[PDB]
Amino acid sequence: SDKTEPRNEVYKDKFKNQYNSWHDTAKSEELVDALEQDPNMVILWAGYAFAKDYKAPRGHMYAVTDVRNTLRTGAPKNAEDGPLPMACWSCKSPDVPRLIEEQGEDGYFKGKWAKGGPEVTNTIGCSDCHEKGSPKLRISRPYVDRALDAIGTPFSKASKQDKESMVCAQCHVEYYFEKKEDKKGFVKFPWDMGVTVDQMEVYYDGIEFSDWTHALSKTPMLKAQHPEYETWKMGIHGKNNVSCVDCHMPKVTSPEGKKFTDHKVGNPFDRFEETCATCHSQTKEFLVGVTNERKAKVKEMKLKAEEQLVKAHFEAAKAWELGATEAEMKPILTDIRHAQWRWDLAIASHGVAAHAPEEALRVLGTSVNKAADARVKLAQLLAKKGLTDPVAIPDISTKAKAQAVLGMDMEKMNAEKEAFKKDMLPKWDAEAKKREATY
Amino acid sequence: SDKTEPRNEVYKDKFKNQYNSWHDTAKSEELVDALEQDPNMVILWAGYAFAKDYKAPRGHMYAVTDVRNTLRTGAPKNAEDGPLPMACWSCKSPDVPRLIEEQGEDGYFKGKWAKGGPEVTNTIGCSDCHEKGSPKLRISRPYVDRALDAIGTPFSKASKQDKESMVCAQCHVEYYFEKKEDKKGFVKFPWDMGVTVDQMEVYYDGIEFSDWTHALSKTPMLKAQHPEYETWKMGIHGKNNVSCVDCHMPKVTSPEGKKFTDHKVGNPFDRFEETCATCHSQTKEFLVGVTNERKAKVKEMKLKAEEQLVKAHFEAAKAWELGATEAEMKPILTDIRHAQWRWDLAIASHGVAAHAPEEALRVLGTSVNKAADARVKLAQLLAKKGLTDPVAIPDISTKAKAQAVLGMDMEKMNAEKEAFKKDMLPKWDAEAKKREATY
Ligand code: HEC
Ligand code: HEC
Ligand code: HEC
Ligand code: HEC
Ligand code: HEC
Ligand code: HEC
Ligand code: HEC
Ligand code: HEC
Ligand code: HEC
Ligand code: HEC
Ligand SMILES: [Ca+2]
Ligand SMILES: [Ca+2]
């Protein structure tokens, strides 16, 4: 393109060190089946693509295999097969700013996932955060800019230290999918109101948005996704503009002598003597062991906010199954909507504990003061509908008992996924070999 | 007798720095009626001491003025009288070690409150932290050094920072008088498990202790009384050995030029240098935004905890009035005791917004999660009992409107105290100067 290059090896030389640390984002390769880890989420996302494959994020060289080989996109056969629209790339490849340059936005967006599938082939790449070649940094998706001009802080008109955290937040944020036909599958950041879990919840609620309808309690359920920049602005780090780069891209020196920026983006503790060493008088073993303590006072309340949530869908699933009305089930599924939305947001980023854990726990607190306002109103209605006992909760100890409790054909899913893994995928990588070897 | 000195005023001249600062705790008379400002404590401390009178904690020259006055203490007619016992003078004056060091603890706590009326007069001061004349921090109390010996850190160990925060730890702690016949009336701190909210729970339980049986929900209630050390131990500076002295007793520089520790104990922002300045490099008002944002996240979740509890107490007098057996209301009532305990600890130290906020929020979170399990249990139960429309809560909007909901004659509580504040108090102040003549 005029503006965007996606072939990531053109810069292996002429940016020698900065390239090979960007390859060290293949130094973190581990499927973390967080559906087998916390099988109480199979049951809370009861009726979404998440009941099928949630994983902790791994390296940055895997953004393209993973967005393919996750059970959340199935075995498509045609260029509209597959449930999820195109825009499920967006945050995986410089083959996204490339194709927003070449067809406006709309030409990228409208269309199912696999249609543009043989066109995204590079992993997360250089011209994503940077200009073409140039050492400068750009925003290479136009919604991200449109989204800043809603919170207050335009890219070019905001300090270098501001920008340090930005280009991290073209991707790592929370997003819906614009339901109008003129925006048929755009990405868009729900900031507009603000970014407290309270301000977002009030936004979506104006536009009665639903990512799905809870296939257990029939609640208009919201799905929080990677709220990184959005929680980072609440932690006393980001209260003083500790950049996203200041920790996850630590400006190191070469064996030889000159300073670059390490482009491996892993755990800032792999480069402690380099990241959080530089702004502190502490030791590691002290600071790491204190982050592993926050990483568990967030863990415990994450669970005793789910146990009231499972115990509520089923305390609502019964409420349906005695025939309650819409009129009756209104302000219950209002509460369950909110109570689970707060639970998702507070811990939909795997580092709210590191980044802003004070706000983690207040959110998780109001995700229970709501679930309460539900399970009270769900048992008072189970009374005036003739139940006075409490509802049972079947064996959801494994992922495979909780997945199978939903009548899911998790076999026909796996069957076709590693079928299409070894059937279409050879083509997408080959048909793109064709064109993208001609520049 | 030898090691104490009740008049800290006898050293006014060898230390005018250490005494004219010490004396400025009296430049602090903001008395806020924390029941005029939350009628939902009234209901939560229903049938207990602080149903009558809770106040702000003002400066130290008032503790023997405040504890002579807080309607909790009541109106003894002689000194075989009084609602409360000895161990209330424990933390309110220097006359206190002068009593254990004349006869021992047996001889102290075995008594009524107004038994030792005109024996404790001089308000808080020197020999409560010091060796008579010596500018050194001894532990004036013995129940302290026995609890400190039960957490593995007696006073001898104590790197000079540990020490520093231990002499605040004799009075700024969570305490219970003991019930058992042989250690009867003695103060005891519940650290045997111990320091944390969860660790004082296993203790206060396994041993079957109960500050009072609630008058609405007929719960065996628990009081949580101003724990600073324990919350402070969990806060970030706690984990960095940043003694209570740094923030509240900075080293203010003399008018002559000396550099003496400030003995006016109060605010770290009525001294933003010497305090926060020696560590954190931001403006006085940036670091004041935080501790207030952090203060009113707790205020939101604290109130959204009393939110449930106040309901669940009335949700329990009905289920009693609708006639329940003891055997029904059993686990429902232990949850209540577990809710309004974790809540009360989370928010008893008039500034845990500042010390560990993250821990008050997790603790405040567990409260609402534990009140939540109770109300469903109360919901199903009141349902089998002919109640299905939700339990109604009456106007409890002011102190004096909620105080008169629990039936309380504040005139025959104010009248009996406007005589005790007029008669039997300059009658103690009389024999004060008499017993203080023999010095
Ligand atoms: C040693 C363990 C401490 C004791 C005992 C107390 N604190 Fe603190 N302190 C600090 C701040 C920033 C505040 C904010 C005051 C407010 O806005 O309410 C406080 C306040 C208190 C209070 C309440 C104040 C009042 O009643 O007006 C009490 C009872 C109290 N402190 C006791 C700062 C710090 C600090 C700096 C890191 C430390 C180590 C402590 N406080 C520790 C103690
Ligand atoms: C810019 C807003 C970012 C982004 C996009 C991320 N961070 Fe952080 N983070 C820091 C530390 C010490 C951890 C602990 C890691 C662990 O315990 O495993 C994290 C956590 C993350 C993760 C999860 C790691 C993983 O493998 O998933 C991610 C994806 C992440 N962060 C992205 C340190 C900091 C930090 C200091 C508190 C700041 C500021 C940032 N990171 C900023 C960002
Ligand atoms: C930018 C706004 C993104 C869009 C649009 C989509 N994803 Fe993403 N993805 C993004 C981030 C910041 C991360 C890592 C953080 C995390 O908490 O996971 C990911 C990761 C994934 C993964 C791997 C983990 C997993 O869930 O298995 C998958 C499979 C994935 N993303 C799929 C996916 C789909 C189906 C999308 C369309 C809804 C999609 N992503 C959009 C950033 C962004
Ligand atoms: C987004 C996740 C990035 C990817 C992928 C790559 N880089 Fe990058 N790089 C990124 C940022 C936000 C910065 C900070 C620059 C600054 O000083 O503000 C950098 C650093 C650079 C620079 C300039 C400064 C430096 O430290 O070297 C250049 C010229 C650079 N990186 C080049 C580069 C190339 C060629 C990459 C593909 C191999 C690459 N980076 C990966 C963000 C991201
Ligand atoms: C869109 C191209 C992204 C941009 C720009 C940034 N990140 Fe991201 N990241 C993205 C995805 C889709 C994933 C999923 C990983 C997977 O394969 O499932 C990730 C992952 C991370 C991780 C985890 C890395 C690890 O070793 O586990 C981190 C720490 C991370 N991302 C941080 C991060 C930072 C700090 C960024 C600004 C430089 C950044 N990312 C940009 C997508 C995208
Ligand atoms: C300079 C750019 C910093 C780096 C690198 C890290 N932190 Fe930090 N931290 C910084 C500031 C300005 C503050 C505010 C306190 C102050 O002294 O002004 C902090 C505060 C913390 C906290 C407490 C609050 C929280 O968000 O949990 C922690 C736990 C903390 N810092 C830890 C930490 C660690 C382990 C780091 C390396 C990964 C780290 N910080 C980086 C500035 C900077
Ligand atoms: C028991 C003898 C105490 C010891 C030891 C310390 N304090 Fe105290 N403090 C005590 C009482 C009974 C009160 C309230 C008095 C009243 O009239 O209501 C206080 C008050 C404070 C305050 C608030 C003072 C103000 O100006 O508002 C603070 C900030 C405080 N206490 C802190 C503190 C510290 C850090 C101590 C150890 C150095 C300490 N106190 C000792 C009782 C006792
Ligand atoms: C030392 C372990 C104490 C004992 C025993 C008692 N209290 Fe005290 N009190 C103490 C502190 C550290 C504070 C400040 C925190 C707060 O919540 O205010 C207080 C506060 C008071 C006050 C001021 C207003 C009020 O809280 O009602 C009074 C009047 C008071 N305390 C009196 C009092 C009584 C009657 C006690 C026996 C039940 C008692 N205190 C116990 C420290 C300690
Ligand atoms: C506990 C609440 C205290 C009471 C009561 C009094 N002071 Fe104190 N003293 C206190 C602290 C925290 C320290 C710090 C020791 C250090 O190393 O900094 C001290 C020390 C002193 C000193 C030493 C001089 C100095 O370094 O400031 C003196 C002369 C002293 N204390 C005298 C003193 C007097 C006369 C008091 C009654 C008017 C008094 N102290 C009360 C804490 C406490
Ligand atoms: C040196 C003795 C300190 C004084 C005086 C104060 N603080 Fe502190 N602070 C100190 C340390 C060693 C740390 C750990 C992280 C770091 O590397 O600096 C902190 C951290 C904070 C935090 C964040 C965590 C929290 O408990 O909320 C805040 C908000 C903070 N510091 C502010 C603060 C204020 C307002 C102070 C005056 C009362 C203050 N600190 C005193 C060290 C020291
Ligand atoms: Ca969304
Ligand atoms: Ca108690």
Residue numbers in the entry:
A (entry chain B), B (entry chain A): 32 to 470
Tell me, in the authors' exact words, what the paper reports.
It is an important enzyme in the nitrogen cycle and is essential in agriculture for ammonia generation from nitrate fertilizers. The PEG is situated far away from the opening of the channels that guide ions, electrons and water into the active heme coordination sites. Very weak, if any, tell-tale DED is detectable near any of the ten heme irons in ccNiR Fo − Fc difference maps.
In these experiments, bacterial proteins with different functions were investigated. Microcrystals of photoactive yellow protein (PYP), a blue-light photoreceptor from Halorhodospira halophila, were used to explore the capability of microsecond X-ray pulses. A nitrite-reducing enzyme, cytochrome c nitrite reductase (ccNiR) from Shewanella oneidensis, was exploited to investigate potential secondary radiation damage, caused by 90 µs pulses, at heme centers. Finally, a first TR-SSX experiment was performed on the photosensory core module (PCM) of a bacterial phytochrome from the nonphotosynthetic myxobacterium Stigmatella aurantiaca.
